[PDB]
Design a protein around this ligand. Sequence first.
Ligand SMILES: Nc1ncnc2c1ncn2[C@@H]1O[C@H](COP(=O)(O)OP(=O)(O)OP(O)(O)=S)[C@@H](O)[C@H]1O
Ligand SMILES: Nc1ncnc2c1ncn2[C@@H]1O[C@H](COP(=O)(O)OP(=O)(O)OP(O)(O)=S)[C@@H](O)[C@H]1O
Ligand SMILES: Nc1ncnc2c1ncn2[C@@H]1O[C@H](COP(=O)(O)OP(=O)(O)OP(O)(O)=S)[C@@H](O)[C@H]1O
Ligand SMILES: Nc1ncnc2c1ncn2[C@@H]1O[C@H](COP(=O)(O)OP(=O)(O)O)[C@@H](O)[C@H]1O
Ligand SMILES: [Mg+2]
Ligand SMILES: [Mg+2]
Ligand SMILES: [Mg+2]
Lengths: 325, 345, 322, 316, 508
Amino acid sequence: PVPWVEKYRPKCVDEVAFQEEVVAVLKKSLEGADLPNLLFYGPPGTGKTSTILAAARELFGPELFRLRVLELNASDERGIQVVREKVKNFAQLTVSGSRSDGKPCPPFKIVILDEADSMTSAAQAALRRTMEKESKTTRFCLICNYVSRIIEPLTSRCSKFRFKPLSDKIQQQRLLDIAKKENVKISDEGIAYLVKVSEGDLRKAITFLQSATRLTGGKEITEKVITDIAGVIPAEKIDGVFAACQSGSFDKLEAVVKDLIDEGHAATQLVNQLHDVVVENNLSDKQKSIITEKLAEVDKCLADGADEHLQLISLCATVMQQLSQ
Amino acid sequence: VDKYRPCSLGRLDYHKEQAAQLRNLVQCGDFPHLLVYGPSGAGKKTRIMCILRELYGVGVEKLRIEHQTITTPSKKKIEISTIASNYHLEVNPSDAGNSDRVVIQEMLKTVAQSQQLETNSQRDFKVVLLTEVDKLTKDAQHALRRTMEKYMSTCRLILCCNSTSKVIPPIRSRCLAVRVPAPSIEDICHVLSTVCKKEGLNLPSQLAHRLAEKSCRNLRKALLMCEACRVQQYPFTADQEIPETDWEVYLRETANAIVSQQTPQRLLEVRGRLYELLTHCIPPEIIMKGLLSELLHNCDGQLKGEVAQMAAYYEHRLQLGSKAIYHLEAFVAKFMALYKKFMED
Amino acid sequence: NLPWVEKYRPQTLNDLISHQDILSTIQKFINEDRLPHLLLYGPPGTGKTSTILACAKQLYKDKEFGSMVLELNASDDRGIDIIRGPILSFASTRTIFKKGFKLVILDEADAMTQDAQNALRRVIEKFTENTRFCLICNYLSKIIPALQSRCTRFRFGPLTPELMVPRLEHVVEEEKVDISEDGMKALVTLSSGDMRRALNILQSTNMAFGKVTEETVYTCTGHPLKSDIANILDWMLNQDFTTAYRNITELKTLKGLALHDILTEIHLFVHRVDFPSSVRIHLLTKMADIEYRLSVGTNEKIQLSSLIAAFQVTRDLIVAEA
Amino acid sequence: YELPWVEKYRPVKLNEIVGNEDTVSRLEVFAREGNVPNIIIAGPPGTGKTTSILCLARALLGPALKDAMLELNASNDRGIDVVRNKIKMFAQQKVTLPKGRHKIIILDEADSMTDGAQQALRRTMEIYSKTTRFALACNASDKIIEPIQSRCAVLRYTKLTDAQILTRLMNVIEKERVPYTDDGLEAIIFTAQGDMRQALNNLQSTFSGFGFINSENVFKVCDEPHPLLVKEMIQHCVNANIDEAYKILAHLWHLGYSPEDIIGNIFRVCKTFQMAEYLKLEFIKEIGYTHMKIAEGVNSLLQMAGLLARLCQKTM
Amino acid sequence: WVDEFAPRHYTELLSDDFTNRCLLKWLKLWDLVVFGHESHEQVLEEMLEAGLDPSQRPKQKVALLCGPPGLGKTTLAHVIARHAGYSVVEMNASDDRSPEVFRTRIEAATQMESVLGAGGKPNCLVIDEIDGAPVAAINVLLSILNRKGLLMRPIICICNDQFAPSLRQLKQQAFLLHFPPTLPSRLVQRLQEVSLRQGMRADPGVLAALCEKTDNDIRACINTLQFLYSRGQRELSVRDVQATRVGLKDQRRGLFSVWQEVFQLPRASLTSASQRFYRVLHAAASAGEHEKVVQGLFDNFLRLRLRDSSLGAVCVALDWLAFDDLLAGAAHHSQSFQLLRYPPFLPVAFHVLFASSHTPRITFPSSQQEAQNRMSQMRNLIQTLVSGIAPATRSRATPQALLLDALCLLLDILAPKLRPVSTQLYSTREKQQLASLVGTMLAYSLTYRQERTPDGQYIYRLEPNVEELCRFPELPARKPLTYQTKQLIAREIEVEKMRRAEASARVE
Ligand SMILES: Nc1ncnc2c1ncn2[C@@H]1O[C@H](COP(=O)(O)OP(=O)(O)OP(O)(O)=S)[C@@H](O)[C@H]1O
Ligand SMILES: Nc1ncnc2c1ncn2[C@@H]1O[C@H](COP(=O)(O)OP(=O)(O)OP(O)(O)=S)[C@@H](O)[C@H]1O
Ligand SMILES: Nc1ncnc2c1ncn2[C@@H]1O[C@H](COP(=O)(O)OP(=O)(O)OP(O)(O)=S)[C@@H](O)[C@H]1O
Ligand SMILES: Nc1ncnc2c1ncn2[C@@H]1O[C@H](COP(=O)(O)OP(=O)(O)O)[C@@H](O)[C@H]1O
Ligand SMILES: [Mg+2]
Ligand SMILES: [Mg+2]
Ligand SMILES: [Mg+2]
């Protein structure tokens, strides 16, 4: 059991790089022993969960880590009743602040809510009501992707801590450090393409590098294993699709669509990469608008559960209509 | 198609580099949760079989049938036919229309909290092979994600599916995605020549190419077509009547009856034909795919494209309701109104 | 010490405001001993619990409030075991106290199922002369029409800012914090017509920074700024597609915005922008579709591009009409 | 300690029941024939399914009602044990009755029972058919199994028509000497939504509140979205206008109404609007689509604005 | 209500005489142990005569009278047990839920040496509604059947659904009677006999019309006969059977109104479209059942004459039906029951779309119910087929893959061209081809089955009826295998099955 996204979490708050302002404010809040307000938010892979776990480890220590820290996934537990019963069951246990090592521990238990922005308004209203139920003995920490998804009352009893996305130089630095630590043979171009396919995510990059070490088995990691583990459709397929739609008939469209489907490539990856291609190139505003609206409708239909081949042939019909006119 | 399936990854005929990646994955420890996907008939079950062969000894090929009794929130005991063994457990949770979450909770609990018998032979984890996870509901996949989170230590899953857009990203992101493409026409012809030459047959290359092009890159169909062509007439000629599946040519005749006449009595006749197709238990997605392909074979003047969009839209409606005959007849009625408008002007 | 709502909770029929017809009718019924089963429904934080607690402390003393009033709330699951459990046994009993009816305060009565509301309908119709229920709920339409047909309903609406600002001025005169005009405008706009969130936001602004202005409220709450949404709409209406997409995705990854909040603030903005009717219909239909597509849980960049797409078709049509 | 008007003015004979016509005539024939079969009474809630079999039983048994009549609601326990014990016990007692008289066991809300309860109720209805006659008041007759309804008569109750509710309400008004206006009667019809007990309760609520009946006083004690404003919103959506319709929608949204309440009043007004038939059907389809969005969990103001834009887009 | 017209002797039964004769033969077969006295029809007569227990008992001790819940099987068992010299002690399995009181009502109530006060009147056990009993009770009855004290009194179980799983372990040692007592010749003969028993005078044609009217029910026929006797009509004519005129209606004459209210325009102010709109809306709401109305509209809007040659209304009606299906799905999923105010607008839309003065034929919807029944039957066929599949080839393919990719090709593999020649005259290649054929039949577990057609000749079919799945009628007909080839391959299949049994005996 080697979870590299958990193994390479900095357990010390001084080991947290790039966020020393938030580290210093967290250290002041821990030493002040009166912390009613706490919130972490940012893009995934920024290590807000690792930062609050490092704060919990530097305050509670390893002995109280399994006692006064409770982590719950909000997206896994979107039901009302489970987060009513588990939070109350954890909060009702009266554990004093006395530590066997003699360190002064202030008397609160910490609660982590991972992906708390996935809740609805009524779920967060019931959550707030539970916060007002147990605002004394235990303390809470919400982790969300966007702070504007969180309803107002939960922003009243918390202090925000914004996270910048990590710059690609320190992303490549951390990836080469981890590859040197675990003796992983991968070139600089492989690291750059690995951070390209995982757009601003160190969790996805760490899991993809772990899977590359699993699938290569000691070999040098190439571009093919990276572009196949992430499921990335190669740019030759997208260029062939746009060549068929630009100058061709529906026989060519059905040929390239059947080739993509029988190659096993997912339609979600195709709509994402076709959106990425069509939002940057030199088409007209009307053509880009019609194609992107069709891509959004296609991804909605794929989320509903509609058949992918019919959606792809309708999407390629729309792209052919816009391009071949 | 079952006698000469390759038992191990070293005996495969196509996709050698993916076999090398999968045997390197087996070659080390911490084998993660797999999500095997692709098109139907590509060889996903063959790859998963070879993975399970490499994961254990020679006793993987032993299989048995159990009829396990599940209990719903309603007091109702429902039997589920599981294909199990002493090293893994293969299940199809899609047979329960609404109780799929209960069976994927209970089988996960009885496979995880019940420890393995002899831990010297197998590893610390045993495999649960879910089959066709795409038609599971969203709350069922959420319960699957919860049970995967709770029991990572002793139960590491392999999810065989197709068309991964029905699968939610919170369970896709936790699994290593392995994509098995359908083999190329040259590789289908090569394995047809191999399966003919190892039983003393004289299949020419032209009939093999016609078999590969006719089967739409489905390998099981392209091999059962070869065996049916052997049985139908043994001396293989380049011009052979390839044995066509009955519902495919019935769908082609259905599209011919659609393009024949644009009158509502023909719509009633085609409603009878669609009802026959529905009561023959084939899914309406395949019906829409075959109908659209056979209508695009008989269309002209760019109208295909509009028809193509139309087909996708009604398939979308078919994924929101429960009575598929309303949406299928809405599609063919709108298509016949559009043809009448196209052929009139 | 304590939160301001738990300090300054109203305890008198005159201390609750904007419900003067409702409070007058409740006082008229309770002076004549003709009070029916009550169903107070409305938005959160508009004075539903505090009104009936003021009426209970008017009816009963401090000593007998804990005996002839049973309170059930969100901590109690509302299924079928409760209605055949403590509330039935509470309603079907007499008391050694003065000869008056009992009282059951059932918070969040809209979370009961149709079978639970029918069982509660049986309990309500069986015992009337000794028990007067009080069901308080957010949505009237989530309960059955039989339950609406046996208990008298009362709509606790939102508080108009014209009537809301004297209580805010009273709590800013009693508690000395810095008060400006734009801070009060931000309070009465972001609070959305309920006193509970206004007092919570005011206390959080006092405890976090110390002064109450518009930008302090916006930074403490995380609400999207008006100039922020103005910049988003300007980028959608007079920039290129790749330029607008890159600018808005950098603003989303910087400011911490989400596409649902961008959607509702842009929806509030486009009814100020004097569009022609046809492009207004097109924008509203497209934005409602984007809201539903975000509700069903898809990728976010593609829906952002569809929003920019609708506004680019809009800007082409606007310039072509000019 | 005055009784509410729901139970105070409940009718005591079959001649005062205004709901059905053929079924009340069948009950009137059954009250004098004396060979009453086991019956199942089906219909919407609140249409009078248990003030009709009660009147039939009181006209049938008469002075021996208290010994030879058992009403079993869903108010008590609805397990299998109480139906096994109490119903069989009551059917096994003897009552000195005339030739064409039988005991009556009314089972209110007979649809919530399981399959075992009704498959035992088959034998309890079959065996004791000479002594007692059953009367199951069911909300939905499709949930009743086929062998139960094969051996028993099926009686159907419709939803109260607005003319019948008008006749009953004017009878209650003339009985209680209530001054009234026609606009107040229209308002109490609109807030009544076809239910008789809801109509009587709203009328007694506004009579205890304000007294004199007028259309302004009905909506002070009910406070639905006002049908004048909702009808103006539908009229603006049908007259190719989106700005004025959204102005009315924002006026009804800054009064704090939920999306569900506004869209329910939107459909209730669009039922009785005045326009073309195909435009009505397209509007009802769009309103149902938007209500599916709202009940799915999308309850923003943008969804109501998109509904208004789609209604304005249907009418060119 | 069956007061004096109840059957009491063997001459008042309303079933076919073969079923009653074999039932009486099974009842009188127990006289060797109770009293101590010393096609499918031929199969039943062989199993009722050839071979008995050493303790003078039959092989089966329980009769499963499976059929529809009416049709008077209980009264038939009562009068036959009265005729055979026993007394009927009936019991019910629906009021008995606890297994302890079940064993009190079975193992402590009857089938012992219950020598009562009437020494010439022994007793027999009659059980009704055995399908609805819990599985513990039927397991207890199975243990009583398998008790070796010994069971001597007969058990006459009454069944309603034969294909319940709880009777999977019982019918192999039971006696099945799925006979349909719907033969009017016998129903009207016993009806004339029971009319002669009292004095009611009825024509045979009128009672035959009543028999074919109320779906050949008999207890309801006696109930309505006593009802018309209480009304006072001493004679019966065609007008007396026209009091209802439909006996197959479960209040279905209202539905034929409302579909007419959808389809037939009211003939002639009342010509306003708002009045017709409100009228058909009120009728659609007042019809009560909605799913039957929707199915009737879907099955009836194309057989009606349509003037829309451009299909300008069929698309709108199918959109409306999809809207109704979406409403049903959303109201079932979100559990919010304020969405059901809309689907009453489905018929009135049809009344706007298909308002015609003509009155075509309106049919009760049979396409949807038989369609779902066909889907259930084909699904159970697939389940039985894959249960027959050996576990090695079971896991290698999904049921949809075998249904859409393999089954027609499997039928084309398993139907080659052969000649009528003996087994020893085949060549080496032909013997290897027959070995491959019988290996496929052994692995996929199918066997050719003999069937007696109603014409009289013998025909051969598949054992799980795979050709029901993998075939369509509108295709051009392919040449099937001849009869003697089916006989030859069935003989090869059974001798290969015996060879496989010998191989499994030699290995084990
Ligand atoms: N400031 C940092 N210094 C050092 N390592 C960091 C820093 N930020 C992130 N990391 C690394 O990034 C990894 C990912 O951390 P996570 O906490 O999973 O990211 P995240 O923000 O929680 O995204 P989620 O969990 O998917 S919402 C950690 O295990 C660290 O190894
Ligand atoms: N009319 C009012 N006048 C003054 N303060 C008020 C008024 N209504 C609400 N408040 C304040 O807001 C708080 C919330 O009131 P409550 O009635 O307890 O909430 P609610 O109306 O029951 O809504 P819930 O409980 O969240 S569903 C009170 O404790 C007061 O501090
Ligand atoms: N046709 C009618 N004429 C007179 N009063 C009626 C009529 N229909 C209903 N009512 C009144 O409405 C109430 C009837 O409610 P009930 O009959 O108890 O409800 P229900 O319709 O039987 O549905 P259940 O029993 O809850 S399943 C009484 O107050 C009656 O006075
Ligand atoms: N390397 C191979 N050699 C021979 N046959 C193969 C090979 N790979 C796949 N096949 C055949 O292709 C067919 C694919 O079946 P399957 O693995 O079940 O596909 P799917 O899982 O997509 O339904 C099988 O019948 C198998 O016999
Ligand atoms: Mg996280
Ligand atoms: Mg409250
Ligand atoms: Mg009632």
